[PDB]
Amino acid sequence: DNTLLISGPFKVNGVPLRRVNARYVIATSTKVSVEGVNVEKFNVEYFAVEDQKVVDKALIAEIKKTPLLKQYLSASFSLKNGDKPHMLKF
Amino acid sequence: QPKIGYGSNKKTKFLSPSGHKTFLVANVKDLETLTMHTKTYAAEIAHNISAKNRVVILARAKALGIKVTNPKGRLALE
């Protein structure tokens, strides 16, 4: 149904599993490998805790390898003065 | 400055915001000509009708289910 599925993880930043519209989202160039988490069961009709824990364990496992990523996901983002989005590489 | 280019669309011409074309009505017999065209037309009681006749016209219009554009005129003000 064209709703992207996202996890905080709730462990890291307190954002649970949720549906988000694609156009209201910016994509950064940094990646994590999603192969660890399987992400087949939950679907659109399902949305109409334990699953989030299962997903979060696998995703944290990959998060640990990259330095400082947990801190990045924990903190929020905002535009400071003098920040021009068009130059800003996200 | 008025000119033909300002002319309104035919399908929307002569239409009130309620969507009913106004038709003048003098008596019950003229009201009954609008029996089924309740969607297309709405009745308007003429200025020269007496108060006694207006209540009869309103009752018959309610019975027929025809919208009256100016009820409570000369039975109420404004």
């Binding site: 989202v25 929020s76 535009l79 989005p85 068009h86 996200f90 | -």
Partner: protein
């Protein structure tokens, strides 16, 4: 801070009350303004919503269309331009 937008000024009308000219900070060239096309504008309590349509001139001023036209007393008033709908 919780700002996820850039507050921009409303300059004037196109000269046409329907179209409004918006000056956005830190935008000197049309190329810089090309990023902001399609973004949602919000004049702020009551809020009127709109969107950025196209660039205007070489100074980086952009055209904007609101659902209801601005009252013309807001020339120089502060106006918000959000990042969504994002194209990045």
């Amino acid at each position: 801070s919780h700002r996820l937008y850039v507050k921009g000024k409303h300059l004037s009308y196109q000269r046409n009350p329907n179209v409004s000219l918006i000056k956005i900070e830190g935008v000197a060239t049309p190329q810089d303004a090309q990023f902001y096309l399609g973004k949602r504008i919000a004049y702020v309590i009551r809020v009127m919503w709109g969107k950025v349509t196209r660039t205007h001139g070489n100074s980086g001023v952009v055209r904007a269309t609101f659902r209801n036209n601005l009252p013309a007393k807001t020339f120089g008033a502060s106006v918000r331009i959000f990042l969504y709908p994002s194209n990045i």
